[PDB]
């Protein structure tokens, strides 16, 4: 039974920044469309294991990720490569399948968001 760890870093002000067509698309298209999905809301902030009473969440999940962090990272130009952002979305879905069980409501929500994520990433420019 533990408290929550601090959330992931969202700004790297000592690293150089770039705006690419790919990075604009990940924020204005991928993140935006997923954020407004009917089942997006549990993924918009880190898992609060104390409020939700999940004492084993951060014993099982050592690489947590959520769309609130991804959004703040894109808004702060944290990513230099679009693949770093894609990896974050993948880690987020993967954690949900590691912690939860087949047929759980949260897993069906992750499945619906991942299908939409693949549809949007399919159309990534360049
Ligand atoms: C767990 C888990 N594993 N991966 N993720 C992303 C989660 C995850 C992340 N955030 C929330 C979350 C945030 C706010 C609320 C509030 C407080 C407003 O009621 C409920 C929340 N639940 C629910 C839940 C609670 C406890 C155990 C499992 C599920 C889901 C919600 C969808 O409908 C089913 C219950 C979450 C589950």
Swiss-Prot record:
Determine the domain of life of the protein's source: Eukaryota
What positions are marked as the site Acetylated histone binding?
100
Write out the PTM section of this UniProt entry: Phosphorylation by CK2 disrupt the intramolecular binding between the bromo domain 2 and the NPS region and promotes binding between the NPS and the BID regions, leading to activate the protein and promote binding to acetylated histones. In absence of phosphorylation, BRD4 does not localize to p53/TP53 target gene promoters, phosphorylation promoting recruitment to p53/TP53 target promoters.
Task: Describe, from its UniProt entry, the tissues in which this protein is expressed.
Answer: Ubiquitously expressed.
Localization, per the record, is: Nucleus; Chromosome
Positions of crosslink type Glycyl lysine isopeptide (Lys-Gly) (interchain with G-Cter in SUMO2): 59
> Domain named Bromo: which ranges?
18-124
Q: What is the effect of changing residue 105 to G?
A: Found in a patient with a neurodevelopmental syndrome; uncertain significance
Task: From the record heading the sequence, give the disease linked to this protein.
Answer: Cornelia de Lange syndrome 6: A form of Cornelia de Lange syndrome, a clinically heterogeneous developmental disorder associated with malformations affecting multiple systems. It is characterized by facial dysmorphisms, abnormal hands and feet, growth delay, cognitive retardation, hirsutism, gastroesophageal dysfunction and cardiac, ophthalmologic and genitourinary anomalies. CDLS6 inheritance is autosomal dominant. A chromosomal aberration involving BRD4 is found in a rare, aggressive, and lethal carcinoma arising in midline organs of young people. Translocation t(15;19)(q14;p13) with NUTM1 which produces a BRD4-NUTM1 fusion protein.
Q: What is known of its domains?
A: The NET domain mediates interaction with a number of chromatin proteins involved in transcription regulation (NSD3, JMJD6, CHD4, GLTSCR1 and ATAD5). The C-terminal (CTD) region mediates interaction and recruitment of CDK9 and CCNT1 subunits of the P-TEFb complex. It is also required for maintenance of higher-order chromatin structure.
Q: What does this protein do?
A: Chromatin reader protein that recognizes and binds acetylated histones and plays a key role in transmission of epigenetic memory across cell divisions and transcription regulation. Remains associated with acetylated chromatin throughout the entire cell cycle and provides epigenetic memory for postmitotic G1 gene transcription by preserving acetylated chromatin status and maintaining high-order chromatin structure. During interphase, plays a key role in regulating the transcription of signal-inducible genes by associating with the P-TEFb complex and recruiting it to promoters.
Protein family according to the UniProt entry: Belongs to the BET family.
This protein is called what?
Bromodomain-containing protein 4
What organism is this sequence from? Answer: Homo sapiens
């Amino acid at each position: 039974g533990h408290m929550n760890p601090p959330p992931p870093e969202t700004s790297n002000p000592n690293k150089p920044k770039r705006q690419t067509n790919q990075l604009q698309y990940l924020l204005r298209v991928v993140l935006k469309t997923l954020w407004k999905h009917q089942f997006a809301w549990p993924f918009q902030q880190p898992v609060d294991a104390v409020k939700l009473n999940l004492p084993d969440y951060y014993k099982i999940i050592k690489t947590p990720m959520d769309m609130g962090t991804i959004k703040k990272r894109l808004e702060n130009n944290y990513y230099w490569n679009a693949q770093e952002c894609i990896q974050d979305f993948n880690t987020m879905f993967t954690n949900c399948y590691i912690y939860n069980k087949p047929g759980d409501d949260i897993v069906l929500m992750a499945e619906a968001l991942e299908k939409l994520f693949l549809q949007k990433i399919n159309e990534l420019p360049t």
